Amino acid sequence: RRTGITTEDAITKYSVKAKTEQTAYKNATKDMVVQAQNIMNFYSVVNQALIPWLNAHGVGGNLRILYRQLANEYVKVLNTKQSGEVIKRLKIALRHKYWLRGLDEAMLDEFMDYIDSLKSTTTNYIIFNMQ
Amino acid sequence: RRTGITTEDAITKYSVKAKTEQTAYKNATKDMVVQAQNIMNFYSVVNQALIPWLNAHGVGGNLRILYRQLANEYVKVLNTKQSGEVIKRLKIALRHKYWLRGLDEAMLDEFMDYIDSLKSTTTNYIIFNMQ
Amino acid sequence: RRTGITTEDAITKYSVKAKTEQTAYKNATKDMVVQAQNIMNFYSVVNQALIPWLNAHGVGGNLRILYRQLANEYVKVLNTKQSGEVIKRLKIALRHKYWLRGLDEAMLDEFMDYIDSLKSTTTNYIIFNMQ
Amino acid sequence: RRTGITTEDAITKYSVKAKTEQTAYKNATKDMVVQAQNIMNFYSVVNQALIPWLNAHGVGGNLRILYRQLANEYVKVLNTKQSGEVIKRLKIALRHKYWLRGLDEAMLDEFMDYIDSLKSTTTNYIIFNMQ
Amino acid sequence: RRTGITTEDAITKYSVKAKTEQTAYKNATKDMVVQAQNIMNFYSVVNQALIPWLNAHGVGGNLRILYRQLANEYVKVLNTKQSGEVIKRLKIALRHKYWLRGLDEAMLDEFMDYIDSLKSTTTNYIIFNMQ
Amino acid sequence: MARKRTSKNDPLRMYLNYVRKLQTMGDAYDESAKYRIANFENGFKSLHMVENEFKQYLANVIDEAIKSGASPQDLPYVNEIKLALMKIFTSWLKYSNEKLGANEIAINVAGTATMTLTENLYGTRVSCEEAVSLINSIFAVWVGVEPFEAEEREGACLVTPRSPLPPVPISSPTGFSAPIQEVLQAKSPEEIIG
Amino acid sequence: MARKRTSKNDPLRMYLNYVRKLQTMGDAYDESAKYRIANFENGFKSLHMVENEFKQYLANVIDEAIKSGASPQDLPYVNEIKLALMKIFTSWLKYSNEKLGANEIAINVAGTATMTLTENLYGTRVSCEEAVSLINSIFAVWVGVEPFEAEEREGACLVTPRSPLPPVPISSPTGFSAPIQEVLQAKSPEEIIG
Amino acid sequence: MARKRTSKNDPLRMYLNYVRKLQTMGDAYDESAKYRIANFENGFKSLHMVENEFKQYLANVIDEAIKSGASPQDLPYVNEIKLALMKIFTSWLKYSNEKLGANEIAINVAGTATMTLTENLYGTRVSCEEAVSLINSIFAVWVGVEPFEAEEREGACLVTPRSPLPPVPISSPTGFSAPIQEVLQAKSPEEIIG
Amino acid sequence: MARKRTSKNDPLRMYLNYVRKLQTMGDAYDESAKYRIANFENGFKSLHMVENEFKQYLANVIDEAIKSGASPQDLPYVNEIKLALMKIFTSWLKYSNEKLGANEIAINVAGTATMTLTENLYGTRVSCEEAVSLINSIFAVWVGVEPFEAEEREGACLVTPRSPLPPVPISSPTGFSAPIQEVLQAKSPEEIIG
C-alpha cells in the first residue's frame, strides 16, 4: 500500500465500515474476556513495587499519578521486548522529560535508581489445542 | 496472451468481475485459515534472531523497523529459493540501498555479517489425501 | 470577455435576469443552510480572542466595533490564504489606517503585537459522496 | 452597504415588507416560547439581590423603580460581556447620571458599593442535536 | 469550405440558428456536469504550487492575479500537449511579455526558474461502455 | 434588522436565528425586486461615469507625460496598477455618495490609499512616490486640490492628507425612467404615471 | 457574477457551486438570446472590416515590394504567417475596443506581437526582422506611426514599442437595424419602433 | 466513567468489574456510532492538514538547503526520520487541540521531542543538533518562533524550550456536513435539517 | 488497522487474531467494492500512461542510437531488460504518487535502481554503465535532469544520485466518470449526479 491518500478516502472508509466494525467488536468481547487479565497482572506488578516506595518516601496524594506516568511508560518500553542497552538511554530521557514537567531531581535520581525492579507484564491466555 | 492492451479493456475486466472475485474471496477465507500460520512461522524465526541483536547492540525504538525492512527483504529473497551465489551480491546491494536511506555503516558491516542465520519460512499446510 | 461595455448593456442584463436570479436564490437558501455555520466559527474564534483583551485592557463600549473593524479585516486577509510575508506589511498598513481614524498608538502597538492569535476560519461543509 | 439613504427608500421598505414581517413574527412566536425564560432568570437574579436592600434600607414604594433603572442598566452592561475594567468607569458614570435625576448621594455611595453581586443573566435554550 | 464570406452571411447564420443552439446548450448542461471537474483539478494543481511561492516570497494581494495570468497561460500551453522544446522558447517570450506589463525582473528570473512543477490538467471523464 | 436590544455575544444564537429566517428570506427577495431594479437603474450610472472619467483623465495625464519625452516602458500602468487607482477612486465615490464632510472623505480615501498602495506595488517596478504624484495629478484635473502627501517610511507605503477633499461632481438622481415606446403608445400623461 | 466577498481558495466549492447553478444556466441562456442577437449584429462588423482591411493593405504592401523586383518565392506569406499577422491586428482591435489610452494599447499589442512572433516563425524561412518591418509598414499605411522595434536577441523574437499607438479607425455602433420589408409593410414610424 | 469515590488499589476488583460490564459494552458501542461518525468526520481533517503542511514545509526547507550546494547524501530524511519529525508535530497538534496556554504547549512538545530524538537517531548518521536546527527552521516557517535549544550532554539528546509556543493555526469545526445529493433532491431547507 | 497500543511481539496472538477476524473480512470486502471500483477506475490510468511513455521514449532513444551507425545486436533490450527499466520507472511513479520532496524521490529511485541493476544484468551482455547512461537519457527526455551516477565498484552495480528528481508529470484525478448512455438517456443533470 501507499501512504499519500486524500481526506475523502479515509472518511469514506470509516463511514462505510460501521456495520462490520461493530459486528466485529461484538466478537471482540468474547476475545477480551480471557485476555483482560493482563490488566490484573499489570496493576499487581506495578502496585507491588510502587506502593511502598511512594508510600514511605513521602510523596503526596495527587502527584502519585505523575510518578505512575513515569513508571507506566517505562513498563510499556519493557514489555515491548526492549532490554538494557536501550533502557540506559531512555532512563535519562524520561528523567529530563519528567523533570521538565515540574518534579524535583532529588526525587528523580533515587526513583531512576529504583526502577529496575519493574519488568514485563503481558502474556498470552489463549492456547490452540486442535483436539 | 499479448502484452499491449488498452486502458479500457483492463478497467472493463476489473469492473465486470466484481461478483465472481468477491465470491472467490469468500472461499479464499476457508483456504486462508490453514495457510495463515506462515505468518506465525515468519515472525517467530525473524524475532528469535533479531530481538537479541537489536536489543543488545543499542539501536532505538523506531529504527528497528528500518532494520526489519532490511531483514524482511532478505528473508523474501531467501524463501523464493535463492541460495548463496546470488546472496553474495544482494547483500552488498542491500547494504548500499539502506546506507542510502540514512543508516550508519558501522552498524551495517556487523549487521550484514549477522544476517546469515535467517533462512526460509514458508511451507505448505494442505495435504491431498484421496481417501 | 472584454471590459469596455456601455451603461445600457449592464442595466439590460440586470433588468432581464430578475426571474432567473430569484429562482436561483430560492435554491441558494438550501445551499446556505449547511454553509452558514462559518458565521458561528468566525464569531467563536474572534470573540474568544478579543473579549478578554478588549474587556481587560479598558476600552469602552462603542469603540469595540472600531477594534472589530481592524480585527475582522485582518481575519479576512488571513482566510484568503495569505501567510506572514504579506502580514508583516499589512500590519503596519492597518496600523496607519486605523491610527488615521482617531485611535491612540499606545493601544495600537500592543494590539498589533496581540493579533497573531487570530487565524483562518472558513471551511467547507458539503461532501460529494457519489454513493 | 452604505449609510446615506433617502427618506422615501426606508418608508418604501417598511411599507412593502408588511406581509413577510408578519409571517416571520408568526414563526418567531415558536422561537419565543423556549427563549422567554430569560425573563424569569433576569427577574429572579435581580429581585433576589435588590428586594432585601431596598426593603431594609428604607426606600419607599415608587422610587424603587428609579433604583431598578440603575440596576437594570448595570445588568445590561454586564450581560453584554463587559468585565471590571469598564465597570470601574461606568459605575461613576451611572452615579452622576442618577444623581442628576434627583437621588441622594448618601444612598448612592452605599448602592454603588452594593452592586457587585449582580451578574450576567441571559443564556441559550435551543440545542442543535442533528439526530 | 472557403474563407472569404460576406458580413451578411455570418449574421444570417447566427440569427437563424438561435433555436437549435439553445436546445443544444440544454443538452450541453448534462454533458458539463461530469466534465466540469477539470476546474477542480486545474485550481488544485495550480494553487498547490503557487500559494506557497506567492505567499512566502512576499508579493501582495492584487498582483497575485498578474502572476496567475503568467502561470495560467503556461498551463494552457502545457495541456495542449507541448513539451520542453517549445517551452524553452515560450518561457523567455512570457518573461518579456509580463516584464513589459510592469513587473520586476528580480521576481521574474526566480519565477521562471520556479514554473517547471506545473503540468497538464485536463482529462476525460466519460467512458463509452457499450454494455 | 438586528435585535437592537443587547449584544449577547453567542454564536449558536446567530446560526439558529439564521436557520429560522431562511424560510422567509426566499420570499422577501421576490418582494424586494420591485424597488431593487429601479434603484440599480439610477445607481449604476455613477459607477460607470466615474470609471470612464478615470480612464479619460489617466489617459490625458499619461499622454502629457509622454509628450515630455519619456518612454512607454518607463510608465506601464497596464492592468493591475490601473485597478489599484480605480480602487482608490471608487472608494472616493462611496464616501462622497454619503453626505459626509470634506475632511472625512479625505481621511477615508487616504486610508484606502494606504491599504491599496501597500498591497499591490511591491515587486512591480513602480515606486510609491510616482504613484502618489499621479494620484495628485488626477485630483488636480478633477477638482484641483492635490491633497495627499506620502512616505515610504517603513516597508509599506503610507498616505496622509494635507487638505480637505470635495465630493464627486456627479449627482445620483431619483428618477423613474420610462421607455420611449411607453411614451409614444400612451394616450395621456397619467397613463405614463399611473 | 462572482461571490465578491473573499477569495476562499477551495476547488470543491467551485465545482459544487457550478453543479448547483447548472439548473439555472439552461434558462438564463434562453432569456439572454433577445439582446445576444442584436449585440452580435452590431459587433461582428468590426471584426469583418478589420480583417478585410488587413487583407487589402497587406496585398498593397506586398505588391509594392514585388514591383521593386523581388521574386514571389522570397516572400511567401501564404496561410499561417497571414494568420500570425491577423492575430496581432485582432488583438489591436480588442485593446482599441476598450477605452484604453494610446501607450497601453501599444504595449498590449507589443506583448501579443512577442507571443505570436515567438511561436510561429521558427522553422519557416522568414526572419523576425522582416516580419516586424512588414508590421511597421502596415501601421504606416493605417495610422502612420511605425511603433515597434524588435530584436532576435535570444532564441525567441522580442517586440518592444517606441511610440504610442492610436486606436482602430472603426466605430462599433449601437444600432437596432430593421429589415426593409418591415419598413415598407409598416403604416407608421411608431409601428417600426414599437 | 470510574468509580470516582476512592482508589481502592486491588487488581481483582478491576478484572471483575470489566467482566461484569462486558455484557453492556457491546451495545453501548452500537449506540455510540451515531455521534462517533460525525465527530471523526470533522476531526480527521486537522491531522491530514497538519501532515500535508509538514510534508510541504519540510520539502521547502530541504530544497533551500540543497540550493546552497549540499549533496542529497548529506541529508537523507527518508522514511523514519520524517516519522520522528511527524511525531513531534502531531503531539503539537494534540496539545494545541486542547485549550492549553503557550508555554505548556512548549514544554509538552519539548518533552515529546526529548523522547523522540532520544530513541530514533542513535546509529543513523544524523546528529541531534542538525535535527533540532531543522525543527527550529520548520517552526520559523509556521509561526516564526524557533523555540527549542538542545544538547547532546549525555548519551541521549535533550530538548528544552527557550520561548513560549503558539498553538496550531488550524481550527477543528463543529460542522454537520451534508452531501450534495441531499441538497439537490430536497424540497425545503428544513428537510435538510430535520 | 493495527492495535496501535504496543508491539507485544508474540506470533500466536497474530495468528489467533487473524483467525478471529476471518469471519468479518469476507463481508468487509463485499462492502468495500463500491469505492474499490471507482478508485481503480481513476488509478490505473497513471500506470498505463507511464508504461506507454516509457515504451515510446525508449524507442526514440534506441532509434537515435541506431541512426548513429550501431548494430541491432549491440543493444538488445528485448524483454527482461525493458522489464528492469520499467521496474525503476514504476517505482518512480510510486514515490511521485505520494507527496514526497524531490531528493527523497531521487534517493528512493536510486535504491530501486541499485536493487534492479544488481539483480538482472549479471550474465547478459550489457554492462551497468551503458544501462545507467540509458536511464539518464530517458530522464533527459522526460524532465531533463540526468540525476544518477553509477559504479561497478564491487560485484554488484551501485547507483547514487547527483541531483534532486522532479515527480512524474501525470496527475491522478478524483473523477467519477459516467457512461455516455447515462448522459443521453437522462432527463436532468441531477439525475446524472443523484
Side-chain angles (χ1 to χ4, degrees), chain I residues 10-190:
Chain I
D10 194 0
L12 189 63
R13 289 173 66 94
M14 304 176 193
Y15 176 72
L16 265 55
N17 291 323
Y18 194 85
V19 174
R20 188 191 65 191
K21 290 177 72 178
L22 279 167
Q23 57 189 355
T24 309
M25 288 160 68
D27 292 332
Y29 189 75
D30 297 332
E31 192 71 28
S32 69
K34 64 177 71 173
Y35 58 92
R36 187 187 75 198
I37 293 169
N39 287 321
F40 182 75
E41 178 86 32
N42 58 8
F44 184 75
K45 292 180 176 65
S46 295
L47 280 170
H48 198 264
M49 287 301 292
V50 71
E51 289 175 352
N52 287 325
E53 289 295 327
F54 167 62
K55 288 184 180 180
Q56 183 66 40
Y57 288 162
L58 181 65
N60 289 121
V61 173
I62 290 300
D63 289 332
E64 291 292 327
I66 291 298
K67 288 180 182 179
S68 295
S71 295
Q73 293 89 16
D74 289 331
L75 38 93
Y77 299 103
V78 193
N79 52 6
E80 297 293 327
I81 309 167
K82 287 182 69 175
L83 191 60
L85 303 178
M86 186 171 285
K87 287 180 185 181
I88 170 177
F89 292 152
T90 309
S91 66
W92 180 51
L93 176 63
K94 186 186 84 170
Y95 290 104
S96 69
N97 202 359
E98 302 171 355
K99 300 296 182 182
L100 289 173
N103 60 351
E104 300 175 355
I105 290 171
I107 62 179
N108 289 318
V109 174
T112 303
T114 296
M115 287 297 291
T116 300
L117 301 176
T118 288
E119 287 178 352
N120 59 7
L121 53 81
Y122 180 77
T124 173
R125 187 185 176 185
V126 175
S127 64
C128 189
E129 185 68 30
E130 185 176 0
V132 173
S133 177
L134 187 62
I135 293 173
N136 287 322
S137 179
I138 296 171
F139 282 113
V141 172
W142 262 331
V143 295
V145 169
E146 295 181 354
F148 299 113
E149 182 70 26
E151 62 184 1
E152 295 176 353
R153 184 182 60 84
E154 295 177 353
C157 186
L158 303 179
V159 178
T160 178
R162 293 182 294 174
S163 65
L165 188 64
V168 172
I170 292 170
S171 179
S172 177
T174 174
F176 65 107
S177 66
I180 193 65
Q181 293 91 20
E182 185 67 28
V183 171
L184 292 176
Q185 298 293 322
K187 298 293 184 182
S188 67
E190 292 87 9

Side-chain angles (χ1 to χ4, degrees), chain C residues 51 55-56 58-61 64, chain D residues 80-86 89:
Chain C
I51 294 298
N55 204 358
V59 303
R64 287 192 179 186
Chain D
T80 59
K81 265 66 182 299
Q82 294 178 358
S83 71
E85 290 293 328
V86 189
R89 187 183 297 158

Side-chain angles (χ1 to χ4, degrees), chain E residues 12-31:
Chain E
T12 305
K13 289 182 181 181
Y14 188 84
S15 297
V16 81
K17 280 186 177 180
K19 183 65 65 67
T20 66
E21 72 191 4
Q22 69 188 1
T23 193
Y25 184 78
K26 189 176 73 176
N27 303 325
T29 59
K30 298 176 186 178
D31 184 74

Side-chain angles (χ1 to χ4, degrees), chain G residues 53-54 57-59 61-62 85 89 92 131-147:
Chain G
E53 289 295 327
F54 167 62
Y57 288 162
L58 181 65
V61 173
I62 290 300
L85 303 178
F89 292 152
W92 180 51
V132 173
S133 177
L134 187 62
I135 293 173
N136 287 322
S137 179
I138 296 171
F139 282 113
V141 172
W142 262 331
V143 295
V145 169
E146 295 181 354

